[PDB]
Design a binder for this molecule. Sequence first.
Ligand SMILES: [Mg+2]
Ligand SMILES: [Mg+2]
Ligand SMILES: [Mg+2]
Ligand SMILES: [Mg+2]
Ligand SMILES: [Mg+2]
Ligand SMILES: [Mg+2]
Ligand SMILES: [Mg+2]
Ligand SMILES: [Mg+2]
Ligand SMILES: [Mg+2]
Ligand SMILES: [Mg+2]
Ligand SMILES: [Mg+2]
Ligand SMILES: [Mg+2]
Ligand SMILES: [Mg+2]
Ligand SMILES: [Mg+2]
Ligand SMILES: [Mg+2]
Ligand SMILES: [Mg+2]
Ligand SMILES: [Mg+2]
Ligand SMILES: [Mg+2]
Ligand SMILES: [Mg+2]
Ligand SMILES: [Mg+2]
Ligand SMILES: [Mg+2]
Ligand SMILES: [Mg+2]
Ligand SMILES: [Mg+2]
Ligand SMILES: [Mg+2]
Ligand SMILES: [Mg+2]
Ligand SMILES: [Mg+2]
Ligand SMILES: [Mg+2]
Ligand SMILES: [Mg+2]
Ligand SMILES: [Mg+2]
Ligand SMILES: [Mg+2]
Ligand SMILES: [Mg+2]
Ligand SMILES: [Mg+2]
Ligand SMILES: [Mg+2]
Ligand SMILES: [Mg+2]
Ligand SMILES: [Mg+2]
Ligand SMILES: [Mg+2]
Ligand SMILES: [Mg+2]
Ligand SMILES: [Mg+2]
Ligand SMILES: [Mg+2]
Ligand SMILES: [Mg+2]
Ligand SMILES: [Mg+2]
Ligand SMILES: [Mg+2]
Ligand SMILES: [Mg+2]
Ligand SMILES: [Mg+2]
Ligand SMILES: [Mg+2]
Ligand SMILES: [Mg+2]
Ligand SMILES: [Mg+2]
Ligand SMILES: [Mg+2]
Ligand SMILES: [Mg+2]
Ligand SMILES: [Mg+2]
Ligand SMILES: [Mg+2]
Ligand SMILES: [Mg+2]
Ligand SMILES: [Mg+2]
Ligand SMILES: [Mg+2]
Ligand SMILES: [Mg+2]
Ligand SMILES: [Mg+2]
Ligand SMILES: [Mg+2]
Ligand SMILES: [Mg+2]
Ligand SMILES: [Mg+2]
Ligand SMILES: [Mg+2]
Ligand SMILES: [Mg+2]
Ligand SMILES: [Mg+2]
Ligand SMILES: [Mg+2]
Ligand SMILES: [Mg+2]
Ligand SMILES: [Mg+2]
Ligand SMILES: [Mg+2]
Ligand SMILES: [Mg+2]
Ligand SMILES: [Mg+2]
Ligand SMILES: [Mg+2]
Ligand SMILES: [Mg+2]
Ligand SMILES: [Mg+2]
Ligand SMILES: [Mg+2]
Ligand SMILES: [Mg+2]
Ligand SMILES: [Mg+2]
Ligand SMILES: [Mg+2]
Ligand SMILES: [Zn+2]
Lengths: 114, 120, 62, 122, 214
Amino acid sequence: SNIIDEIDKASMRDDIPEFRPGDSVKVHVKVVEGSRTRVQVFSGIVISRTGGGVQESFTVRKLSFGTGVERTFPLHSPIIDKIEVDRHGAVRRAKLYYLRGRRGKAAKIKERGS
Amino acid sequence: PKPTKGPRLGGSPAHERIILRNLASQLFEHGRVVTTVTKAKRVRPLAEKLINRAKTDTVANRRFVNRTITDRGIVHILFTEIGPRMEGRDGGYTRVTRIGIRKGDNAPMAVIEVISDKVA
Amino acid sequence: AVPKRKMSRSNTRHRRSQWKTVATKLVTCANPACGEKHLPHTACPSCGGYGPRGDRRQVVEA
Amino acid sequence: MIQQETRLKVADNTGAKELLCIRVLGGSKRRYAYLGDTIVCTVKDAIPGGNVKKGEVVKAVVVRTVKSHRRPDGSYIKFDENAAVLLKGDGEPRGTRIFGPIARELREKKFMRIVSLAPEVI
Amino acid sequence: ERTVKGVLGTKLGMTQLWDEHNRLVPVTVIQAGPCVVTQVRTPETDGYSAVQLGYGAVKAKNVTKPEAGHFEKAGVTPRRHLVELRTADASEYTLGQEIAADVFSESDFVDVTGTSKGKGTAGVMKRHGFGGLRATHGVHRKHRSPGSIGGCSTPGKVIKGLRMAGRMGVERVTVQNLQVHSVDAERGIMLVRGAVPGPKGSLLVVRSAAKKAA
RNA sequence: CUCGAUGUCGGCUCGUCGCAUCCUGGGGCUGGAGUCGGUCCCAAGGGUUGGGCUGUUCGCCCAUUAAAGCGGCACGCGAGCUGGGUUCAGAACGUCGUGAGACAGUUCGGUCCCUAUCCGCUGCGCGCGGAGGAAUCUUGAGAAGGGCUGUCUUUAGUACGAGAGGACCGAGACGGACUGACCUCUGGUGUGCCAGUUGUUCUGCCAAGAGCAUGGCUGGUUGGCUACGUCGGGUUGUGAUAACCGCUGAAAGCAUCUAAGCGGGAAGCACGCUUCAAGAUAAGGGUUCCCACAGGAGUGUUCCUGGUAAGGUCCCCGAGAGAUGAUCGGGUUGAUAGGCCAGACGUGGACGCAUCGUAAGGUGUGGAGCUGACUGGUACUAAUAGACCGAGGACUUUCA
RNA sequence: GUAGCGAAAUUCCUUGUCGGGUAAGUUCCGACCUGCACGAAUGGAGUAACGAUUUCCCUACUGUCUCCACCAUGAACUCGG
RNA sequence: CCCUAAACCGACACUGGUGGAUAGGUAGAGUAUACCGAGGCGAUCGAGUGAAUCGUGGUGAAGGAACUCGGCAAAAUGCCC
RNA sequence: GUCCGAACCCACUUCAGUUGAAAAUGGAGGGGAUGAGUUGUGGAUAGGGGUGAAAGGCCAAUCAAACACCGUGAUAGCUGG
Ligand SMILES: [Mg+2]
Ligand SMILES: [Mg+2]
Ligand SMILES: [Mg+2]
Ligand SMILES: [Mg+2]
Ligand SMILES: [Mg+2]
Ligand SMILES: [Mg+2]
Ligand SMILES: [Mg+2]
Ligand SMILES: [Mg+2]
Ligand SMILES: [Mg+2]
Ligand SMILES: [Mg+2]
Ligand SMILES: [Mg+2]
Ligand SMILES: [Mg+2]
Ligand SMILES: [Mg+2]
Ligand SMILES: [Mg+2]
Ligand SMILES: [Mg+2]
Ligand SMILES: [Mg+2]
Ligand SMILES: [Mg+2]
Ligand SMILES: [Mg+2]
Ligand SMILES: [Mg+2]
Ligand SMILES: [Mg+2]
Ligand SMILES: [Mg+2]
Ligand SMILES: [Mg+2]
Ligand SMILES: [Mg+2]
Ligand SMILES: [Mg+2]
Ligand SMILES: [Mg+2]
Ligand SMILES: [Mg+2]
Ligand SMILES: [Mg+2]
Ligand SMILES: [Mg+2]
Ligand SMILES: [Mg+2]
Ligand SMILES: [Mg+2]
Ligand SMILES: [Mg+2]
Ligand SMILES: [Mg+2]
Ligand SMILES: [Mg+2]
Ligand SMILES: [Mg+2]
Ligand SMILES: [Mg+2]
Ligand SMILES: [Mg+2]
Ligand SMILES: [Mg+2]
Ligand SMILES: [Mg+2]
Ligand SMILES: [Mg+2]
Ligand SMILES: [Mg+2]
Ligand SMILES: [Mg+2]
Ligand SMILES: [Mg+2]
Ligand SMILES: [Mg+2]
Ligand SMILES: [Mg+2]
Ligand SMILES: [Mg+2]
Ligand SMILES: [Mg+2]
Ligand SMILES: [Mg+2]
Ligand SMILES: [Mg+2]
Ligand SMILES: [Mg+2]
Ligand SMILES: [Mg+2]
Ligand SMILES: [Mg+2]
Ligand SMILES: [Mg+2]
Ligand SMILES: [Mg+2]
Ligand SMILES: [Mg+2]
Ligand SMILES: [Mg+2]
Ligand SMILES: [Mg+2]
Ligand SMILES: [Mg+2]
Ligand SMILES: [Mg+2]
Ligand SMILES: [Mg+2]
Ligand SMILES: [Mg+2]
Ligand SMILES: [Mg+2]
Ligand SMILES: [Mg+2]
Ligand SMILES: [Mg+2]
Ligand SMILES: [Mg+2]
Ligand SMILES: [Mg+2]
Ligand SMILES: [Mg+2]
Ligand SMILES: [Mg+2]
Ligand SMILES: [Mg+2]
Ligand SMILES: [Mg+2]
Ligand SMILES: [Mg+2]
Ligand SMILES: [Mg+2]
Ligand SMILES: [Mg+2]
Ligand SMILES: [Mg+2]
Ligand SMILES: [Mg+2]
Ligand SMILES: [Mg+2]
Ligand SMILES: [Zn+2]
């Protein structure tokens, strides 16, 4: 019902930038270190956006030290300080799962308006 | 529209798709059709989707309707007679009425028919 | 498996008596000019019409 | 998820290149090992020049699972290869270096040395 | 013998929240609507202490004369549902009294009772977790069989209570120690941390946690 | 006992029971510094792993675990599965026999079936009864389920001990296994949805599409179902006890846990928690509704017919329900479903047009078009119209 | 009883012993000879190639399995014959 | 008149067996396979319904023989240069 | 008596069937597929005999001696009535 949605509006945020899978994104994830806290930047390619209200989440793929790391973030999670969009990709798919098995020049995304 | 949940007509989902499309085409061809209860009640949503799409006449809409039906003569009927007949109707372009049963196999039979009178 | 013994008359009849059918109910046609019996929520086979005394839309050409 | 007969790669420089999970420590009947779980392994393949021989039974901690890992904040982490890090029987690495990214779940008060040597903790 | 607070509601669905430790918590949304005390049961007249609550929106043409008379004696408008709450403080309840979701605070533990979702006639492998037979290696038309169901000439019988196929679901299930996340009484909404039995729209009984807490 | 047939090993599945207890609980004696141990009692509530070898049982071994118990049930369980072993016809080896052949010697190969009548058992209905007919909410005689456990932190380096070592009794945190519900999250599915694409046929052709090839094949994917998913659960306790520890105390001037009596005392017993439950024919209880109908026989009215009240069913639209019955909701005084309108999800840029490119194609118009289940509206379509059942002051007796 | 072969389709004892392979190998692969009861045209020992033969191992691969879920269908199920 | 069959051999108007001739198009090496032609058929009980279950197909996270007497079945591999 | 592979011939594995569609088959794979190949028509060999790339195989759907009739109402210390 819309009662569920109006309850969700209390948890949803407003400062989310507009982006699509295929875009290069830096997510400023807050990391708890005992007494300390820090902001660690996860830079990568958005490969999926599973939508729907406060349930919206997006997946970012990074290539670090010869291994791929995928992180899935709820788009309205309070652990995300902010989201930066670097490149706007030019893809043809909603889910970029094919990038999992691609590395090198075959794994790079065209920029929007090219 | 919504899938059929249970087992499909004609012993196969592909055959059910064919059956529903042909049955909608025959409904549009003849105005009314006696086609047992389950087939009529399963073809009603598709037929009303098609009629609603045909309520507004554009070339793109005619091609989209011709994706189904596939008989351009029936497409012409739908876009010329059935379509303008439902200018003021907000849905409910067809009605189903039970007739009885078939002697051979006791199939409950019903006639589905496009609305004939103008709403205005 | 196979029936070990011939079932008694009492038990056979107890089971067989439950193989039955209910009578079809039938309703009087709302059309005053017809007044015949038809199935509920079904067009009258005689007049070929459906609906209350007012509406009365033709359904079957019979 | 790492179960018996799962083969893992090594994030250490002990010379071992591939481990076979013989058991998942943590209780009887336990099925799977996740990020930060300790397993008993055998060394299927090792570098000829190294301090670990093939067929040696060792203990390792699982890092870099392929399946997924949920976190209490609702996020998930996923890698592209099942990895593991050998141990000296007291919670400390046998090797002197760690390779590739390491999960944050290793920094649950437990594997401080591994997290310190981690090139990247995600 | 135990004093229990209670309220009736409807399962509206689920969503998710983030608590103050930034933890994702699944919450069920219960329209813990206004309930009215239709009847109070006393040891003198009934033999036990309990409070009958109403709750529910009902059409005036769907309430029969006996129900209408019951509600008229209660002095309240007719409600769709009627459920009792076995409380030892039933007396403190007056006939026609108003009960709202604010009967529960922001961190009370509760027990939620509802009728589970139905599954129809379920097999042994589904309704009892039976491990069947293998898929290959000569298994002959018994891949989901229940296996043996007894011994031999002794006891030459099938013991009572053996788990076999049958209809699963649609039964009273109580899930305990769910911590209420939030209560908004002005619209009768309760957010309860967890998953409660039953499909969306079912009736739910939210009572104080019998075992208090963990 | 069975030869007008009682199918014979091990595993799989499903259990159930005994206790001669493997772990967990309790206690004596030793002890034993502690830490641990080992032994005689109690105790069957729950739990009691995954693999290598062999057809194996057995057994050995690897890695764990609180522990990897022993047995019964036709050495439980082939109208449940397995056929590897055994015990058919083929063949070979060794040994034996002149030979046909033989071998609890070995080796390779090697048919089974069953639509469940009765009891049994898991589920689900119909009927009748519950002394008037109904509607709702219930009590619980009784029944079932559930009952596992680890590691770490702290008490405390305290007690103990010469040191090294290292507690009991309590407190807290986090797990394994098991399990209930559940779909917000993650994963899987997807005969719907969107998209791409090969071959081919077709819609006259272009354009745009359609059929078939496993949904032709691929890329995704809401709803639903689900676990690999996330929430919860075991308990905190009470009573009477087991072994055992006692108090007072004789018989027997003492003593003695006992003969009178009282107290402690375990995961066991009975409760506590969850669930079913008045066919509990002992058929319960509360609250509410309907009412003294009609016509015959009659032999105290009796009893049989008939129309109703309260109420219910049939029929129709459905799903939160479902094999079918059933259940729940709706039935025009109506949002029950479909359609329609809008939204969300999903796909990812439709047709057309403009422009660029020789062309395949690119860009723009434009998060476009399409679109199911989810959400909100809206009587446009179908829930027409009607029947049928259903008390009568409700048997009798005594009380008040 | 020679050449050769030998715990072998032959070895009872027996899972012989040692060695290899496995984290763990009554099978296997190479050896030993103590051949219960090998052995030279009922041929001995080998052998490239061949085998829907028997046996062991590695790799790839997977619902074989941990642990099953979901989809569509022919029966099953309801109605008529 | 039937004749790779409902008419023959199988007790049947039986998913079996039955010799020879003709045998087009596109993709293809092909008489394989896919979709079509000439031509012929819609198959000789139906209508429904998301039960368990059996048969027949399909897909699958992570793992990859831990299954099992045994990799049984399936998956992978597959064509041309 | 080459290789891959349809027709054709075969019958290795598996599943289904097992009161079957079928008194031996069907689905999925599998072997041969210029040869000791396969197949049509007609013919020859006959029961202590046939024929057998040999399994006591086959000789009109049960062959360690076919089928039919006859001796014949065989005989049975056995079972039944
Ligand atoms: Mg989206
Ligand atoms: Mg569906
Ligand atoms: Mg059918
Ligand atoms: Mg198709
Ligand atoms: Mg009976
Ligand atoms: Mg299974
Ligand atoms: Mg099978
Ligand atoms: Mg008996
Ligand atoms: Mg007998
Ligand atoms: Mg005992
Ligand atoms: Mg036990
Ligand atoms: Mg007991
Ligand atoms: Mg042994
Ligand atoms: Mg036992
Ligand atoms: Mg036995
Ligand atoms: Mg049996
Ligand atoms: Mg055998
Ligand atoms: Mg046997
Ligand atoms: Mg030899
Ligand atoms: Mg001799
Ligand atoms: Mg054998
Ligand atoms: Mg059966
Ligand atoms: Mg009771
Ligand atoms: Mg009883
Ligand atoms: Mg959802
Ligand atoms: Mg998904
Ligand atoms: Mg065609
Ligand atoms: Mg394919
Ligand atoms: Mg979903
Ligand atoms: Mg004394
Ligand atoms: Mg004393
Ligand atoms: Mg375009
Ligand atoms: Mg040996
Ligand atoms: Mg031996
Ligand atoms: Mg050895
Ligand atoms: Mg010689
Ligand atoms: Mg010789
Ligand atoms: Mg010899
Ligand atoms: Mg020879
Ligand atoms: Mg030789
Ligand atoms: Mg050789
Ligand atoms: Mg061979
Ligand atoms: Mg291997
Ligand atoms: Mg069927
Ligand atoms: Mg029938
Ligand atoms: Mg022909
Ligand atoms: Mg035929
Ligand atoms: Mg014939
Ligand atoms: Mg060609
Ligand atoms: Mg062909
Ligand atoms: Mg033609
Ligand atoms: Mg023909
Ligand atoms: Mg026929
Ligand atoms: Mg059905
Ligand atoms: Mg497959
Ligand atoms: Mg998929
Ligand atoms: Mg998989
Ligand atoms: Mg995978
Ligand atoms: Mg692999
Ligand atoms: Mg194995
Ligand atoms: Mg095993
Ligand atoms: Mg195979
Ligand atoms: Mg394959
Ligand atoms: Mg050749
Ligand atoms: Mg032929
Ligand atoms: Mg054979
Ligand atoms: Mg079989
Ligand atoms: Mg060859
Ligand atoms: Mg002749
Ligand atoms: Mg012989
Ligand atoms: Mg013969
Ligand atoms: Mg003779
Ligand atoms: Mg004579
Ligand atoms: Mg005689
Ligand atoms: Mg006899
Ligand atoms: Zn009429």
